[PDB]
Amino acid sequence: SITAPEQGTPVGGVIAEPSAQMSAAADMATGKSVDSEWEAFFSFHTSVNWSTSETQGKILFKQSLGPLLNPYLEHLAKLYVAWSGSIDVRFSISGSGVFGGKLAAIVVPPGVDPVQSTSMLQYPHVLFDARQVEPVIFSIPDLRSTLYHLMSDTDTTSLVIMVYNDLINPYANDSNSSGCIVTVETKPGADFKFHLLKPPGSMLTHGSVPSDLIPKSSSLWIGNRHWTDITDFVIRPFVFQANRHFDFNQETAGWSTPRYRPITITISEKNGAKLGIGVATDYIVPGIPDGWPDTTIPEKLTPAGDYAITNKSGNDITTAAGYDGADVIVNNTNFKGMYICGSLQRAWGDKKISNTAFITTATKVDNAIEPSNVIDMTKIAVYQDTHVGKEVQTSDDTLSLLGYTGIGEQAIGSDRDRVVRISVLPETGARGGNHPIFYKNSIKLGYVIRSIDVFNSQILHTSRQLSLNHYLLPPDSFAVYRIIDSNGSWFDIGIDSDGFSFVGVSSIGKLEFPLTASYMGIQLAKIRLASNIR
Amino acid sequence: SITAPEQGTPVGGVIAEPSAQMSAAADMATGKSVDSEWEAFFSFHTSVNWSTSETQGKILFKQSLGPLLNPYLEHLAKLYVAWSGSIDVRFSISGSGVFGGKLAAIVVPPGVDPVQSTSMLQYPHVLFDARQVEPVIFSIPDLRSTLYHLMSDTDTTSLVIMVYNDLINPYANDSNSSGCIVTVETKPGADFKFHLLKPPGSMLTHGSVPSDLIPKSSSLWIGNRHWTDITDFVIRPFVFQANRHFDFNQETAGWSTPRYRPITITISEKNGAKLGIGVATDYIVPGIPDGWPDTTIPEKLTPAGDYAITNKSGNDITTAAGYDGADVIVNNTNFKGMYICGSLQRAWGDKKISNTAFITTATKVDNAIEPSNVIDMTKIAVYQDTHVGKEVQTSDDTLSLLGYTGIGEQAIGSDRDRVVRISVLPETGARGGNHPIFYKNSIKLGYVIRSIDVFNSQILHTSRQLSLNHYLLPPDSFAVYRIIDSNGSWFDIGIDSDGFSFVGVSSIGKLEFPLTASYMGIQLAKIRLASNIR
Amino acid sequence: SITAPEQGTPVGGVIAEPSAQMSAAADMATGKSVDSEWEAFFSFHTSVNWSTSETQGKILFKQSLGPLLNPYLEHLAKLYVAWSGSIDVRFSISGSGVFGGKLAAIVVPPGVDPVQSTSMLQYPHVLFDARQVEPVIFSIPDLRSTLYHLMSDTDTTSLVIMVYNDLINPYANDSNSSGCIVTVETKPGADFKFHLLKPPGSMLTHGSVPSDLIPKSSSLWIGNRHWTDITDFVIRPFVFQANRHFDFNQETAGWSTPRYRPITITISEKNGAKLGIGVATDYIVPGIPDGWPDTTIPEKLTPAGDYAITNKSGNDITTAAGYDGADVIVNNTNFKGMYICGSLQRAWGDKKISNTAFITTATKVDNAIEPSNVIDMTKIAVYQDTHVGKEVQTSDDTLSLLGYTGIGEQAIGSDRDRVVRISVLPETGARGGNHPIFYKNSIKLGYVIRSIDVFNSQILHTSRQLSLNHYLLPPDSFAVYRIIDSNGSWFDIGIDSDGFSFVGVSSIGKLEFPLTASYMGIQLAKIRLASNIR
Amino acid sequence: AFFSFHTSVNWSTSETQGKILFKQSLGPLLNPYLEHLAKLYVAWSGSIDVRFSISGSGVFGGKLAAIVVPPGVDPVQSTSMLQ
Numbered sequence A, B, C: 001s002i003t004a005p006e007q008g009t010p011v012g013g014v015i016a017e018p019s020a021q022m023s024a025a026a027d028m029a030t031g032k033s034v035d036s037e038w039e040a041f042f043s044f045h046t047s048v049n050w051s052t053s054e055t056q057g058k059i060l061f062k063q064s065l066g067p068l069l070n071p072y073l074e075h076l077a078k079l080y081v082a083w084s085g086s087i088d089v090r091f092s093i094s095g096s097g098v099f100g101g102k103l104a105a106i107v108v109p110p111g112v113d114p115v116q117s118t119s120m121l122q123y124p125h126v127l128f129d130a131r132q133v134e135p136v137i138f139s140i141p142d143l144r145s146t147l148y149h150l151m152s153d154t155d156t157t158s159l160v161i162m163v164y165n166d167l168i169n170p171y172a173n174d175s176n177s178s179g180c181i182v183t184v185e186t187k188p189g190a191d192f193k194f195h196l197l198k199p200p201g202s203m204l205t206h207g208s209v210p211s212d213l214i215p216k217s218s219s220l221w222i223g224n225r226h227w228t229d230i231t232d233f234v235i236r237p238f239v240f241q242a243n244r245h246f247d248f249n250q251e252t253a254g255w256s257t258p259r260y261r262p263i264t265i266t267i268s269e270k271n272g273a274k275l276g277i278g279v280a281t282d283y284i285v286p287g288i289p290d291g292w293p294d295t296t297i298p299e300k301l302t303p304a305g306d307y308a309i310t311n312k313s314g315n316d317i318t319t320a321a322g323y324d325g326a327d328v329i330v331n332n333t334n335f336k337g338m339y340i341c342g343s344l345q346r347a348w349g350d351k352k353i354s355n356t357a358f359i360t361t362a363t364k365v366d367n368a369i370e371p372s373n374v375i376d377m378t379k380i381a382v383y384q385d386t387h388v389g390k391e392v393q394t395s396d397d398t399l400s401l402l403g404y405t406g407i408g409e410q411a412i413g414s415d416r417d418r419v420v421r422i423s424v425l426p427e428t429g430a431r432g433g434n435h436p437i438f439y440k441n442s443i444k445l446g447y448v449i450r451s452i453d454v455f456n457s458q459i460l461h462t463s464r465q466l467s468l469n470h471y472l473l474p475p476d477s478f479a480v481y482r483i484i485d486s487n488g489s490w491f492d493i494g495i496d497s498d499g500f501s502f503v504g505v506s507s508i509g510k511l512e513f514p515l516t517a518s519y520m521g522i523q524l525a526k527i528r529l530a531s532n533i534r
Numbered sequence D: 001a002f003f004s005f006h007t008s009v010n011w012s013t014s015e016t017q018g019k020i021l022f023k024q025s026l027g028p029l030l031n032p033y034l035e036h037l038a039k040l041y042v043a044w045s046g047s048i049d050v051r052f053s054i055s056g057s058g059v060f061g062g063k064l065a066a067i068v069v070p071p072g073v074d075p076v077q078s079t080s081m082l083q
């Protein structure tokens, strides 16, 4: 009639029933007399070194209250929404007995962000010595303004250790420098309850937690400008892109989408017009084909004929030794800064073999094209030899990004004078000590078999997910993903609300690329991102 | 000296301690009774249709014992090596006192391969009717020879539902099967106990369930054979594909991967050869490129010229009204059943810009080709003019699947004899009362503006996830997903371990395509699925 | 609503009543026990040998525990999936007074790979001298680690006989062909008890018990290479076959199936070729037909004419019963070695009585052929008088195999290089002092009336069941089937996982062929089998 | 101590007042367990129980009639047995 979450007429196992005489035997083999073991045994969280060079007032440990301080709880929070109560944080240390040095400990209240200075000690502090023997506990209370917390709450109580009085090795010279360590462990406490069970596969209203922007492995990675696989990271102080740069508001200023499909267009050439103006057929913005690239011609030019290079007046390369041995590759070609576009080129009557295309954003001037770094319905440009004879053709077409022809140039995307915004160029400088990065992609070339580099603001999959999946990120904060090469050299990437990646070191160097990417958590953009290199 | 897993001298939160009076107020917000909520209610598991046709001695439901029957446990089984105890599985029949048809319920001991036969009822069977008021329970016990199971064990108790009196309803039809569905829900049971805690790392993370095999919309969908979108579902009692047809064993007969990238090959010529034997530059199988397609030529033919099609076998025609205004179409062309790839067509020292290519598999004999379907490193075929005079060329190339040539044809992937398989062709037939399907996907044609209809066995996104993630399913079941056209109608789809989609209706027809998809559960393979049309 | 397993409305005996004064009357005439009577005597089980050639330390009879040791229990165990408890045993010898010699009987615990030596006797050993008239009783307890066992478990306690002192017959030290038969008999202890009804018609997962691999008559036996009936057996050190040879993983290296049906192919030839190449219609492996033979020509040849058989290299063409006088019948023919097949030449314009096949596998270089050690779709041979001319005359042929042509050759199968293998050739040697075998049927010749011998690795019914059904056997074990002639002369066949048979002697002689069979258990591979013959 | 499936029938519409739907002399053969054990004996004695279930949950009108005929007779396909 009206049945409840447990109501149901029982019948029992038909041949047997659950024999509780049995299950004790399992409890007899093991020590299983109690559930929720994690409430009664400590757990590693991190460890610290403390040495004589680390002076007074330094902050060693700094962690905020939360479930993440014991990974069991990090695993159970996925079921639930909320949490309330305290945490314990064991401290253990072993010094020689000849050493000295006293070491502090402070719970701070929420809303603050501590500072490596003694003014932090103008506050109730507990000390302990490096001669300490029995470990120490420091129950961290929950000092909150609300009845409970969600999992996306950083404004919490927190803890710090700091070097009250420095370390002393009497036997040591001042040149050589030793140092003990400090091991930290945690435990949930006693008043620590979660709350508000979540029905899977729900979608948390403010948004989910970003942990799928970057695929872990590498082979799943391609850039948001050209389909070729990542190979290396590139630092710049400034970054900028609009074609597929989707922010956490799931929008942009671009025109394109995160799918590298062909590009259907139509084109209405009259007399012998190799070129024309291709018009939109599929899009999200009116008058712009989806997936269209973002790069102008460098300079004005006349699309006329075939490739041309040089070796400074004028010994043209036709091999590798000249090219790789050449000084400059000045590229006298007359269709320089365009893509290559596989070019189906259908129409009624063109019983031909569909010659190949070249494109850019630019205004035509009656035979030629002028650069213009803003797209409209008009800038779309072509050069593909539609086999025209003053017999007006009106060909349908469909293309595919393959390479580039501006040989000798720098890697694409480092010149905002060229890049094709509409009105807004999304952009960041740096933030804190953390610097931006592009992602590199080798792209193909037309005449010389070599390949040039590309710059990418985002992996595609990083942009696909943001077209769809509304996430949380306070704009002052980052989504911290951690990288590990085959060797073990790691560094942390940060990702902003806008979408532009960030990193906390001035260079990388070389590394075994079959690298992976793991999740860490949220971190504040006002802080540097870590790195262990070499 | 020693310190135990809990020992450590306390000092407490120095500014304040945790107040239980606070944490109670959290419980005052919620209705927090006790942790381990999952031991006090039920959870959805699946839902099984039961049409008129299910003659008795035919099974509906079959599930072994284990924690995977309740995801709250599935999330905790990663923390404990071992488990033990019972499990209650609720049942509830749709059709509120309207229908007839008893339905059995058997627990079998471990170590069996049950059979759709009445001999299974030569055993203690419980029956219940389709006029059931209160849902039904059937507490499964844990019968075993060892004290505690592991997570990997399978030799366990298992429940089955089987038919005992075929139903009755005058309110259904032969095509659609709206009506009976048998909801199943679970609950751990009193004696259920995990055992033998483990640290995370290890967190093996296997048990991946089908939930992302299809998106929740159409516009993401694309056939594995060709990049264009879906627009219709097609039935055929047989089914066949090999290029990208992946199974839950994460393998195939397919030389290719699920990525529509281009195809790089280094063709070579001597004097004037248009055609040559393309060779790999990227692959997973030796010799064959990735993304290389599967459709042979129909016949022997000497590719030597341009397009030509003629109506009536007495004419030549180059316009739409003449195209449709046609007795038949003839295709007097020399590259008939071929493709339209882009062909960047590079080389060292070779101007005379890139042209278009045409590719299939075929065996080449000195000026021509013939259809072979058993692809090897020799069967590759091209017809691009790389401008070769009297000398080897060493023409590197890249190619992206972009069209077709065989006008006059009206579908692809329907003649299995022309399909390219390495050695084996995956294939199925009808099952239960369910039948296979294809996913239609329009495609380009070349000289003529029209298109033609492809058959596809798999969405790419389906085939991508199978390439990677070890999804779980028995050999004789589906991973059912639902479909809802935007007229409100719906039908279900099943996915066997092989990857072939399956359906239960006899027809589809036209439908409001802007549709959705969702996951209902697991269903035994040998049963008619559900449906409702118009 | 629900009806439970034992829920109904008892109206009962309408005319009468199931009384109780009567049932006890039947009891007192026949007597009773506690619902069972096979727990009070010693069933007969088997009998084995003990001859002079079995020296000290050697073994005769290892069977593990299980209900197979009592034919009342092997019967019942088809109702249950489980068991637990011991056995009582009685063995004895039917020896003369002169036949001195001593014997042993040990229960070895589980998890042992015992040895045909004497070190086992340091375990508690029972004795039984041949002179000892009266039998002996002892027990076999179920020393196990689990709460119980399953029928698919074969890692239990096990009995072993061992020759504590060898046999002696002081009289006939000429032939050494003595007897001393042993017998074994079983009674279960009251501790014995089954568990866990198996739902009838249900199989097991680990696999069934092999007790239907061989029929119970020679009349139902035929070879896995030719349809003829068995006549006699053969021993060889090396044994091998690939055509219809299946293993207990339901696999094979073959191309064929366990049938003997007409083959159907499709010639396509011209110019009076008479040497076509057959393509496939039905198969399991592509290219190769099903039921196609496993034999290559001896050597190269050129088919034009017809038969020829001559006495020697200096003389006549025997063509009569005066041919045995040759002893070196040399077969100087047009062709040799082929297998004959009937035919049905269906070609649309061949209004003539169709004509015989003369096929094999071989390479067609030219109008001649050459040997094909290996099979492929190009290595299929025919020599028909297919009624053709200049013009192509395609036809279906519908072959069916009858006999053989390689007069004078030895029994087929010996010639390894003539035998066909795709890639792999299953092969064995001696094994634990046993010998492998073939099975000898006959096959018929072309010209003379006579019949040459043929070898076979399996009976056909042994091969149908293994393609289909999932039997159980560990690799270090056999399936012991006892073979009996019309006399009481008998022996035992073991069968490994691969399907190759084995025997524990080096000869058979001849015997009353109306023979039978019976399953007897699971003996190791190390161990010698029985032989009670002459 | 429970019930075991034996067989199944079709009491369709075109069957009338006097047909027989089921007729089996007594023996082990009314239970496929016992039949597997009659191979181990040459005798039996005692009643057997039976159970029916009709599939007309509340719909199908129409009833049946049962008789326990004695040993020696061989019943017929008429109404007279209902005397």
Ligand SMILES: [K+]
Pocket (backbone or CB within 6 Å): A344, A345, A346, A347, A350, A351, A352, A353, A354, B447
């Ligand atoms: K064209």
Ligand SMILES: [K+]
Pocket (backbone or CB within 6 Å): A446, A447, B345, B346, B347, B350, B351, B352, B353, B354
């Ligand atoms: K070129």
Ligand SMILES: [K+]
Pocket (backbone or CB within 6 Å): C345, C346, C347, C350, C351, C352, C353, C354
């Ligand atoms: K004929």
